[PDB]
Design an enzyme around this catalytic site. Structure first.
Site, short mmCIF file in Angstrom:
data_model
loop_
_atom_site.label_atom_id
_atom_site.label_comp_id
_atom_site.label_asym_id
_atom_site.label_seq_id
_atom_site.Cartn_x
_atom_site.Cartn_y
_atom_site.Cartn_z
N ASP A 204 -6.90 0.88 0.49
CA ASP A 204 -6.46 1.60 1.68
C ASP A 204 -6.50 0.68 2.89
O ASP A 204 -7.50 -0.03 3.10
CB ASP A 204 -7.35 2.83 1.90
N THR B 45 -2.21 5.39 5.87
CA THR B 45 -2.72 4.47 6.89
C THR B 45 -2.09 3.09 6.75
O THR B 45 -1.75 2.45 7.75
CB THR B 45 -4.24 4.38 6.80
N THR B 46 -1.93 2.62 5.51
CA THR B 46 -1.24 1.35 5.29
C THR B 46 0.23 1.44 5.67
O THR B 46 0.83 0.43 6.08
CB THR B 46 -1.38 0.93 3.82
N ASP C 79 -8.12 11.07 0.50
CA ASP C 79 -6.68 10.83 0.55
C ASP C 79 -5.90 11.89 -0.21
O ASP C 79 -4.77 12.20 0.18
CB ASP C 79 -6.35 9.45 0.00
N1 LIG Z 1 5.32 6.19 -7.36
C1 LIG Z 1 5.87 5.68 -6.23
N2 LIG Z 1 7.06 5.04 -6.26
C2 LIG Z 1 7.63 4.53 -5.16
N3 LIG Z 1 7.06 4.60 -3.94
C3 LIG Z 1 5.87 5.21 -3.76
C4 LIG Z 1 5.19 5.80 -4.92
N4 LIG Z 1 4.04 6.33 -4.47
C5 LIG Z 1 3.98 6.11 -3.13
N5 LIG Z 1 5.08 5.44 -2.71
C6 LIG Z 1 5.35 5.03 -1.31
O1 LIG Z 1 4.19 4.43 -0.74
C7 LIG Z 1 3.97 4.89 0.60
C8 LIG Z 1 2.48 5.11 0.83
O2 LIG Z 1 1.96 6.01 -0.14
P1 LIG Z 1 0.38 6.03 -0.46
O3 LIG Z 1 0.05 4.77 -1.22
O4 LIG Z 1 0.06 7.37 -1.08
O5 LIG Z 1 -0.29 6.00 1.01
P2 LIG Z 1 -1.20 4.79 1.58
O6 LIG Z 1 -0.19 3.79 2.09
O7 LIG Z 1 -2.01 5.45 2.67
O8 LIG Z 1 -2.03 4.29 0.42
C9 LIG Z 1 4.80 6.16 0.77
O9 LIG Z 1 5.53 6.12 2.00
C10 LIG Z 1 5.73 6.21 -0.43
O10 LIG Z 1 7.10 6.12 -0.01
#
Ligand SMILES: Nc1ncnc2c1ncn2[C@@H]1O[C@H](COP(=O)(O)OP(=O)(O)O)[C@@H](O)[C@H]1O
Ligand SMILES: Nc1ncnc2c1ncn2[C@@H]1O[C@H](COP(=O)(O)OP(=O)(O)O)[C@@H](O)[C@H]1O
Ligand SMILES: Nc1ncnc2c1ncn2[C@@H]1O[C@H](COP(=O)(O)OP(=O)(O)O)[C@@H](O)[C@H]1O
Ligand SMILES: Nc1ncnc2c1ncn2[C@@H]1O[C@H](COP(=O)(O)OP(=O)(O)O)[C@@H](O)[C@H]1O
Ligand SMILES: [Mg+2]
Ligand SMILES: [Mg+2]
Ligand SMILES: [Mg+2]
Ligand SMILES: [Mg+2]
Lengths: 100, 39, 191, 538, 541, 520
Positions: free
Chosen positions: F55, F88-89, F386
């Site tokens: 994160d 957050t990222t 999260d």
């Molecule tokens: N399985 C997936 N395939 C493609 N893009 C994804 C997938 N899961 C998440 N994302 C992308 O990653 C971004 C961040 O998601 P997430 O990792 O849940 O949040 P964080 O950046 O806080 O860890 C989202 O905007 C989404 O578009």
């Protein structure tokens, strides 16, 4: 892949090389010439005053004209050396008006 | 402008004088030389 | 390294009981017996607790000799006050002796008039605070301009007692270390 | 990116972070590689103080030697956390994470992604959980087989100590564990079983005491040493002086009134002693034959000890919190705090109470109970490290054998579990599994990493590790076709296979389950990390 | 979790070595860091450019708004900058023109390629893209030529050649300095009806003699040269002989002594009496022959003895040292004589002619002037610079060296044809390359478009130094090229530049074809190297 | 000399150049920490611990940068974490690009830093419009879709393999804290950890979980229907707010003073037994004399319990915070307690309190975590924050935006199309907003290993023609529509990402000079 723990960034110019951007440097160059100008301000005219200079070698040299006053004071700043070059050039070509 | 402000070399040892008070020391310095040989 | 020492050093007998559930019994009870013995020594040393208004003959009787104590170098600090009713700082310093006497029972608080203290003493130099210990004068303090003057407070007086070696720095009775219960209550909530 | 931000920092990324986690893993593995197994080498730990403590437990090695690497501190918490609740499987977690990283790192160099590799470990882990159900065997506790508990106790004790200490200390554990099983079937280890240090003749003279032993005795000489029938009494009331909440001076006026007020110090103590005398009057019959003993949790005033000495009542003060929670189990009585309400029902029973002293210290022994619900294990030893070695051996031995009674299953060891998972993962049809793509090597990497543990046992014996598995492989090839379900082992004495069912080598159920679960989580998280850095205010 | 394991390849290469590879971020570290020095050459570009004062470690101060003179003195630790440094020096030594475009076009290709690398385009494809775009640029520049010159002799024709070059450096002085350089080239070139077959020209023909003091308007042209030297022996006649034969001797005028050391040996006193007269009669036999043919001037490179100087004073022969060897042969080209290390005797074929030699002070110091009228000269000229400061005259010398270097760039190849300047052909190349990118489908089309965007700095840099808005005159200039008349659209620099349109032929601003081709090639090769490297290995100090 | 300044004043254009390079450097640290194939990050704090996570917020908490422009970028993660709790990222990686794309212009085409701000608010106003149009509503009561909505964020973490259990774990926890608008808060969500065990047997249980055991051994370890009563004062004898200072004269006074110490604790215990409770939970400590006579009535005594847990016990058992014991009644006594039981774990004892399960105050709960080690617990605990953060947005806002970069790519296309019709001086910064919004799918393709040149070219060709729900499959690296892919995220996270990223650029773009070392 890397050779060691960390890798500090390179400074582009050499370490200790002074440099500056903006309008601050040209104002400092103009103020440097005005600082040299104020030494020769009251010297101009028949009722003017002479200037006493004593260099590092401890040899007294009194003068009224600005040709040898600027030659004694070894000038570091390039902008202040412009007044010294024209004073020697005026002294070499004509021989009058080195202060004006 | 930066903290360094240099025009000539060795500004710390070189010190100017000006005004009426600067000329005052010159004549009074001659009194010390004159007063020695006054007697 | 300090994280292990803060469990025992930064907790009194009342605060050491909080670690009964987390820390080991033998580790905690071994130090509680040590701190309990230190509390018993202070009770035996609490031979005072109110201002000793003495006469001039007794001045030797209660001050210098007392400062010897047991003479085990059981020294006792004796704060003398050359009082003078006319001066403003004298009545302020007299109030601090009454307040400090109720708290620090091991330290002897002494008061005497300045006219009865020294032969024809200068009134301008009053009030005067002397600190005896084992017969020797540790501090011959001058009027309270050093301690704020007319605006002297109880916190400034307790800080002076720590400088002369009369009270430890980390003593729980000092107002600097004796944090309010509301202060510690807010710290636990925001932790 | 970090150097222009922070003026001072260290950063490793994308090749050194992988080499660090593998190099630190192989380095820490080499430390605990030689200790694993019965013929492993001992390891002492001496600090700057000069004290000595000897044991083979990986937790003691990790939680006493300070370590600077960021990978090993996670292996230290993983090896410690698995052992702190289970009591066994410490070095097994280090060997799995120590081997699974290097066994996957060769394929990271080939160019396989870390994500799909760890996906293969997780789906392979679910196959091992399904395999634990078929691999385990049911055992009924109603039989109360004492020989089965003896063989389980020798599995852990042979690893730590030699056969001379194992044979004499094995039935000490079995007699303590035989009383654990009851109708309620509720396991209780910390309150029931305890360990106490005592410098005495030798480690071989460790004996089992059915009752609760205490580290204190009678202070006065005239108080009785031995008591035949001692009815205990529990009282958490403090019978010395009390300072009384702000109460201050006994302002005395005349000299006669001074000592008249000093006599009131005894009145509060005598008010409580009279209740004990009133209780003794009810049980006054057969006073020379029978006896009475009082055990207090807090201190007793020395002025009141003479009261008990005159009535020949044994006094014991400043007991532990745990011992007060054990007198009811041993003597069968009930606990009491206040002296107001007493009865003869709460008094316990004891068949023999005697004291023996050595040097300045004195120990009180209680035993010969009618129906003791708890007991103790008084371990003897010569040196301080001898007690520490017996501490870790008894601490790890009781937890290993206690888990067998928690569940109705037991896992045979000696490499049978790891060798069985090797053939299962290497012969199982992949179409049944849901993993596809580059998960081919992830199954082979984790399946091949399990083989390094049973040969680490061989590396301490000095035989060739690859050759002693040849007949093991040939045995299982014919065992499936021979229609005979048998489990092979690894005997280090002769360098040949064996059967753990008849030899008595066994292992607990939750040890291998929690070990692979904790090891797979740590090893997976270390593989996905591709950058190391240090930053903060100090 | 306090001390790291310290990167266990530390057993490999020593701590002084630093690796800054890619993936880690080398390209991002480099293209950026060099933006500081990119702004240095950008601010010093154009006629309104700002000169930069560079003080070296010795203390010799220089003030020059070029790029080759600046970067030579700058001690630059960054290795990726140094690829741009000596690449600019290649333009200085070979052509002597375009240092600035190179430092600017080479840096902008790295700056504009930030979008390609950040988007994720392969580095190998970018090199192939600019190489094919470089080939199309060289082929397309030939079609936009309208200045096909074939005379290259007369002075007025050089106004389209020298004055754009002089207008860049110190724009205020155009007619004066162009008159000095153009009149110098006319004296250099010989008088003939048709001089062909690639006549020889070199940068050492036109020299620069710096004199302190005097306004720039008071300068003049001298066919000979001027040395800061003291004549000895006599005053010249200045109109009496009408012409002077000048002998140039490599060896000094003295008795011929051997390389091996000897001394005087005298067995008796009879030789002692004749030795005083023998040295006088020895030189008299060799000196009298020189005076018979009327050699009114002798030049001896080494130190001349007093005995040889004494015999020459009575006959009125001019003497001169000329210690340096490089400037000794240039005097021979003026008179048209050969060097003679042998004493021998003067012959008519090997001796030249000089009209007159006169001595005065130009800036207070006595100097010797070799100006001659009605004489034959071949590849020799000088420009006497008068100025208030030595710091300013140093820039006039390099401006003249770049001016005469362009003459070397014209006459050495078969054609040095002109092109439209003032931001005219650069915007045309943007339209040509924009149309070229759509002809070839493929992944390399993004490289072709971004190669065209790098040429945008040339017009706006003139507008930025002019104090004008880039977002007004630059897009307005594109509307002027919509459609000869559209080719001669350029960037105006004046108070009436709100329209943003000024015809080129009113002031005749032009650039060279060969200069821009060599600049585009060295600029592309400079950007090719920086984008091709991935790992940079340093060392201690 | 003059005032404490003028060491080296970074003024003019070079000051902003360092800020864009410094702001870009923050995003480069966590460039690989995005998407389903994201890499982990182990940071070393100087105290002695370790933080293992991916994160961006938890990474940037431990890092320390000695630069003032990068610290404003550091604080944006606290804006996202303490607003929603997810993405957050995404906030840190988008802003870097916005500051970077606007830079070309600042450095070269000389657009003043205020005209860019005016261009961004109209882009911000249009960004909320297209994000509102691209999002589709979803039913809140559908548990089948809610499980797939919760596991969208879990897919980018380590526990995607246990996603079948985590969605059931998070869904039951959110509905417990949810109050019947629909406001919930995570302060009652207990983050108690248990090192060791398997993740499969880990489950949420209604009620609390203490770290302590009973004091006396005779206390009942298994009660059918506990009746909990909370106490704030200690059972010890209160000294009082003022000194007693009893002047003793007679001998029958000191034993009386020690006897009333026994009778006062009898008086407070006897009035507690008027209601006859089974479990008495005291905030402060307890005395040894008082526990026996509470056992005579049948109560159970515990050690000092911090009031953070007692407030959870008040909502579970329905009791009230009580300090004055004389005013104890039968109505304020906790009831409807399911079961009481104490398990044996080698770390510490653990007392379980189960609820009968059968409006009123919102109920609390404790989520059991059975990880592999200590770092695995802290890793999984942040995943629940999260994962449970996603469940709040669907209840507060029924809108649901597409994931996989489809939402931000939709902002890129409409801003790019509308930039042509926006002719003027604002066109160049307005068109540069689309250049950064198309990077958050570019980062997914780079982590997946594919070529983002042809994928983004194929994306824009199909986005206008095919549908508005097109996106990139992070695992396979091919174009797959979000409708068939079955993964969706809330629209609230997309709003905070666009708002916080643009609002951060408006602050940092106004920076002219940097002067360090003035005073404290
Ligand atoms: N399985 C997936 N395939 C493609 N893009 C994804 C997938 N899961 C998440 N994302 C992308 O990653 C971004 C961040 O998601 P997430 O990792 O849940 O949040 P964080 O950046 O806080 O860890 C989202 O905007 C989404 O578009
Ligand atoms: N007799 C005069 N009457 C009026 N002005 C004079 C006279 N003599 C000199 N000056 C003025 O004094 C100024 C300074 O002259 P001075 O300092 O003596 O010469 P220089 O500056 O060359 O040393 C000149 O500009 C001149 O105009
Ligand atoms: N005498 C023996 N014969 C065969 N195998 C043994 C013997 N003693 C121990 N082992 C094996 O050594 C392994 C480790 O045992 P143990 O020491 O209890 O755990 P750890 O080494 O993880 O602390 C077990 O899997 C067990 O099967
Ligand atoms: N009066 C003018 N009007 C328009 N353009 C001018 C004028 N004077 C100079 N320029 C332009 O300024 C530019 C300066 O180019 P410069 O960098 O000196 O050439 P090079 O790089 O070949 O040395 C020239 O290309 C020229 O077209
Ligand atoms: Mg004059
Ligand atoms: Mg073991
Ligand atoms: Mg030029
Ligand atoms: Mg997320």
């Amino acid at each position: 892949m890397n050779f060691g723990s960390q890798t500090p960034t390179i400074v582009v110019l050499k370490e200790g090389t002074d440099a500056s951007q903006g309008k601050g440097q040209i104002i400092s160059n103009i103020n440097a010439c005005v600082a040299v100008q104020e030494a020769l301000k009251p010297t101009l005219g028949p009722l003017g005053s002479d200037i006493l200079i004593v260099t590092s070698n401890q040899k007294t040299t009194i003068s009224n004209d600005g040709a040898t006053i600027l030659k004694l004071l070894d000038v570091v700043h390039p902008a202040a050396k412009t007044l010294v070059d024209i004073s020697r050039a005026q002294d070499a070509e004509v021989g009058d008006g080195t202060t004006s | 402008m930066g903290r360094p402000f240099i025009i000539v070399k060795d500004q710390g040892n070189k010190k100017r004088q000006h005004g009426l008070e600067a000329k005052k020391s010159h004549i009074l310095a001659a009194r010390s030389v004159a007063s020695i040989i006054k007697t | 390294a300090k994280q292990h020492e803060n469990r025992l050093e930064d907790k009194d007998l009342s605060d050491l009981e909080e670690l009964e559930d987390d820390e080991d019994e033998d580790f905690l009870e071994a130090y509680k017996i040590k701190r309990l013995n230190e509390i018993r020594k202070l009770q035996e040393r609490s031979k005072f607790g109110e201002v000793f208004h003495i006469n001039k003959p007794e001045y030797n009787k209660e001050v210098t000799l007392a400062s010897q104590g047991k003479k085990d170098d059981g020294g006792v600090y004796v704060f003398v006050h050359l009082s003078l009713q006319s001066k403003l700082q004298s009545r302020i310093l007299s109030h601090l002796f009454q307040s400090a006497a109720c708290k620090f029972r091991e330290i002897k608080f002494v008061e005497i008039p300045a006219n009865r203290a020294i032969e024809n003493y200068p009134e301008s130099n009053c009030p005067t605070l002397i600190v005896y210990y084992r017969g020797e004068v540790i501090k011959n303090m001058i009027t309270l301009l050093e301690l704020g003057g007319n605006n002297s407070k109880m916190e400034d007086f307790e800080d002076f007692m720590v400088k002369v070696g009369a009270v430890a720095e980390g003593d729980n009775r000092l107002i600097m270390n004796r944090d309010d219960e509301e202060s510690r209550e807010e710290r636990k909530l925001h932790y | 990116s970090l150097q222009l931000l922070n003026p001072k920092a260290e950063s490793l990324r994308r090749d050194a972070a992988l080499k660090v986690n593998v190099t630190s893993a192989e380095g820490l593995q080499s430390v605990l590689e030689t200790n694993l197994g019965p013929k492993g080498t001992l390891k002492m730990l001496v600090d700057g103080a000069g004290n000595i403590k000897l044991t083979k437990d990986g937790k003691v090695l990790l939680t006493e030697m300070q370590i600077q690497s960021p990978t090993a501190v996670l292996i230290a918490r993983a090896a410690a956390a698995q052992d702190e609740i289970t009591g066994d499987g410490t070095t097994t977690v280090v060997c799995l994470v120590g081997e699974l990283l290097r066994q996957a790192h060769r394929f990271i160099q080939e160019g396989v992604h870390p994500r799909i590799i760890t996906d293969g470990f997780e789906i392979a882990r679910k196959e091992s959980m399904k395999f634990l159900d078929e691999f385990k065997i049911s055992k009924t506790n109603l039989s109360n087989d004492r020989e089965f508990l003896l063989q389980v106790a020798r599995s852990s004790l042979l690893t730590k100590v030699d056969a001379d200490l194992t044979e004499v200390l094995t039935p000490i554990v079995t007699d303590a564990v035989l009383s654990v099983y009851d109708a309620q079937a509720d396991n209780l280890d910390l309150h029931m079983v305890e360990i106490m240090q005592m410098q005495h003749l030798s480690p071989k003279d460790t004996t089992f005491i059915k009752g609760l032993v205490l580290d204190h005795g009678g202070r006065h000489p005239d108080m009785p040493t031995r008591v035949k029938n001692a009815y205990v009494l529990i009282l958490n009331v403090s019978l010395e002086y009390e300072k009384t909440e702000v109460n201050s001076g006994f302002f005395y006026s005349s000299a006669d009134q001074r000592d008249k007020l000093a006599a009131s110090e005894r009145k509060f103590v005598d008010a409580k002693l009279k209740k004990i005398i009133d209780l003794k009057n009810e049980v006054c019959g057969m006073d020379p034959d029978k006896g009475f003993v009082i055990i207090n949790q807090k201190g007793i005033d020395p002025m009141s000890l003479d009261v008990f000495a005159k009535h020949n009542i044994l006094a014991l003060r400043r007991a532990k919190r745990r011992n007060m929670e054990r007198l009811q189990l041993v003597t069968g009585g009930e606990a009491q705090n206040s002296v107001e309400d007493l009865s003869p029902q709460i008094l316990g029973f004891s068949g023999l109470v005697y004291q023996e002293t050595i040097g300045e210290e004195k120990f009180t022994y209680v035993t010969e109970n009618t129906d003791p619900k708890s007991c103790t294990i008084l371990i003897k030893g010569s040196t301080h490290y001898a007690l520490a070695q017996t501490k870790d051996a008894v601490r790890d031995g009781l937890r290993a054998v206690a888990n067998v009674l928690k569940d109705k299953n037991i896992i045979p060891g000696a490499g049978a579990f790891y060798i069985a998972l090797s053939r299962y993962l290497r012969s199982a049809n992949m179409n049944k599994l849901g993993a596809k793509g580059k998960t081919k090597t992830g199954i082979e990497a984790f399946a091949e990493a399990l083989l390094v543990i049973p040969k680490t046992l061989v590396k301490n014996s000095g035989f060739d590790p690859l050759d002693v598995l040849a007949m093991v492989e040939d045995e299982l090839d014919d065992a499936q076709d021979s229609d005979e379900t048998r489990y092979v082992g690894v005997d280090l004495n002769i360098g040949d296979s064996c059967d753990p069912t008849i030899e008595g080598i066994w292992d607990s159920y939750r040890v291998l389950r929690n070990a692979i679960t904790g090891a797979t989580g740590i090893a997976s998280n270390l593989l996905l990390c591709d950058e190391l850095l240090r930053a903060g205010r100090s | 979790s306090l001390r790291l394991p310290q990167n266990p390849n530390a057993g490999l290469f020593k701590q002084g070595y630093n690796s800054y590879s890619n993936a880690d971020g080398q390209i991002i570290k480099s293209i950026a860091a060099i933006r500081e020095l990119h702004q240095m050459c950008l601010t010093s570009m154009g006629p309104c450019g700002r000169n930069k004062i560079i003080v070296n470690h010795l203390g010799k101060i220089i003030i020059t708004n070029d790029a080759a003179t600046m970067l030579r003195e700058l001690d630059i630790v960054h290795p990726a900058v140094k690829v741009l440094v000596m690449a600019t020096e290649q333009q200085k030594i070979d052509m002597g023109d375009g240092t600035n475009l190179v430092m600017i076009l080479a840096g902008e290709l790295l700056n504009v390629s930030e979008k390609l690398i950040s988007m994720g385009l392969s580095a190998v494809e970018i090199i192939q893209g600019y190489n094919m775009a470089r080939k199309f640029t060289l082929k397309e520049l030939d079609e936009m030529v309208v200045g096909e010159i074939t005379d290259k002799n007369d002075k007025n024709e050089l106004l389209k050649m020298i004055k754009p070059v002089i207008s860049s450096k110190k724009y205020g002085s155009e007619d004066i300095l162009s008159e000095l350089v153009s009149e110098a080239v006319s004296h250099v070139l010989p008088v003939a009806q048709q001089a062909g077959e690639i006549p020889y020209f070199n940068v050492d023909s036109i020299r620069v003699v710096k004199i302190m003091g005097g306004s720039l308007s008071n300068s003049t042209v001298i066919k000979g040269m001027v040395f800061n030297r003291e004549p000895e022996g006599h005053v010249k006649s200045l109109s009496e002989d009408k012409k002077h034969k000048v002998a140039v001797f490599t060896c000094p005028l003295d008795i011929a002594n051997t390389e091996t050391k000897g001394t005087v040996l005298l067995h008796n006193a009879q030789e002692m009496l004749d030795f005083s007269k023998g040295e006088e009669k020895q030189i008299d036999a060799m000196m009298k022959e020189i005076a018979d043919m009327g050699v009114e001037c002798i030049v001896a490179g080494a130190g001349v003895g007093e005995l040889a100087l004494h015999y020459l004073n009575r006959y009125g022969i001019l003497v001169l040292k000329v210690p340096s060897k490089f400037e000794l042969r240039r005097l021979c080209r003026v008179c048209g004589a050969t060097p003679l290390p042998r004493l021998g005797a003067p012959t008519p074929e090997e001796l030249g002619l000089v009209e007159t030699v006169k001595t005065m002070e130009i800036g207070g110091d006595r100097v010797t002037v070799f100006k001659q009228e009605q004489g034959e000269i071949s590849r020799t000229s000088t420009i006497i610079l008068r100025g208030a400061t030595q710091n300013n005259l140093d820039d006039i010398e390099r401006a003249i060296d770049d001016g005469v270097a362009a003459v070397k760039g014209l006459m050495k190849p078969s054609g040095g044809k002109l092109l439209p300047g003032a931001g005219a052909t650069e915007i045309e190349l943007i339209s040509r390359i924009t149309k070229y990118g759509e002809r070839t489908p493929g992944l390399l089309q993004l490289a072709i478009k971004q190669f065209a965007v790098a040429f945008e700095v040339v017009p706006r840099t003139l507008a930025e130094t002019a104090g004008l808005d880039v977002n007004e005159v630059l897009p307005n200039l594109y509307a002027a090229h919509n459609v000869t008349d559209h080719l001669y659209k350029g960037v105006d620099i004046d108070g009436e530049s709100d329209e943003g349109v000024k015809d080129i032929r009113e002031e005749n601003i032009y650039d060279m074809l060969a200069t821009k081709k060599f600049a585009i090639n060295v600029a592309t090769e400079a950007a090719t190297t920086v984008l091709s490297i991935d790992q940079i290995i340093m060392a201690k100090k | 000399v003059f005032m404490n300044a003028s060491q080296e004043r970074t003024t003019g254009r070079q000051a902003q150049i360092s800020n864009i390079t410094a702001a870009k450097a923050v995003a480069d640290v966590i460039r690989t920490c995005l998407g389903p194939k994201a890499m982990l990050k182990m940071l070393l704090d100087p105290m002695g611990g370790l933080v293992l996570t991916n994160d961006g917020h938890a990474i940037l908490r431990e890092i320390d940068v000695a630069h003032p422009a990068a610290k404003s970028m550091l604080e944006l993660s606290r804006t996202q974490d303490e607003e929603v709790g997810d993405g957050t990222t995404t906030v840190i990686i988008l802003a870097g690009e916005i500051l970077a794309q606007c830079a070309p212009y600042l450095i070269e085409k000389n657009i003043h830093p205020v005209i860019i701000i005016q261009a961004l608010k109209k882009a911000l106003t249009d960004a909320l419009e297209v994000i509102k149009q691209v999002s589709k509503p979803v039913d809140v009561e559908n548990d089948a879709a809610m499980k797939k909505l919760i596991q969208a964020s879990i897919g980018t973490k380590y526990v995607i393999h246990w996603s079948e259990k985590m969605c059931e774990l998070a869904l039951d926890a959110v509905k417990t804290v949810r109050k019947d608008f629909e406001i919930d808060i995570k302060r009652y969500v207990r983050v108690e950890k248990i090192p060791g065990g398997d993740v499969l047997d880990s489950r949420v249980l209604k009620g609390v979980l203490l770290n302590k055991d009973v004091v006396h051994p005779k206390m009942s370890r298994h009660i059918e229907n506990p009746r909990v009563v909370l106490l704030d004062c200690p059972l010890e004898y209160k000294k009082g707010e003022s000194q007693t200072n009893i002047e003793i004269e007679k001998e029958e006074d000191w034993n009386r003073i020690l006897q009333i110490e026994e009778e006062q604790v009898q008086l407070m215990c006897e009035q507690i037994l008027a209601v006859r409770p089974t479990l008495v939970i005291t905030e402060k400590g307890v005395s040894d004399l008082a526990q026996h006579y509470l056992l005579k009535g049948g109560c159970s005594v515990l050690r000092r319990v911090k009031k953070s847990d007692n407030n959870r016990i008040a909502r579970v058992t329905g009791a009230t915070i009580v300090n004055r014991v004389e005013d104890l009644k039968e109505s304020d006594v906790g009831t409807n307690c399911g079961l009481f039981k104490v398990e044996m774990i080698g770390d510490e004892y653990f007392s379980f309190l189960d609820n009968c399960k059968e409006s009123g105050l919102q109920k609390a709960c404790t989520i059991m975590l059975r990880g592999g080690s200590k770092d695995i617990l802290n890793e999984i605990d942040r995943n629940l924050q999260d994962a449970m953060a996603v469940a709040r947005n669907v209840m507060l806002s029924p809108s649901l935006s597409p994931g996989g970069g489809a939402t931000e790519m939709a902002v890129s296309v409409k801003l790019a199309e509308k930039a042509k019709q926006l002719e003027g001086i604002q066109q160049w910064p307005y068109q540069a907003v689309a250049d950064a919004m198309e990077c958050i799918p570019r980062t997914l393709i780079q982590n997946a290993g594919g070529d983002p040149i042809r994928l983004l070219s194929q994306l824009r060709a199909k986005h206008a023609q095919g549908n508005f729900t097109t996106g990139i499959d992070g695992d396979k690296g091919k174009i797959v529509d979000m409708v068939s892919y079955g993964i969706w995220e809330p629209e609230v996270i997309k709003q905070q990402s666009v708002k916080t990223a643009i609002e951060s650029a408006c602050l940092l773009l106004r920076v002219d000079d940097i002067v360090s070392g003035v005073r404290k």
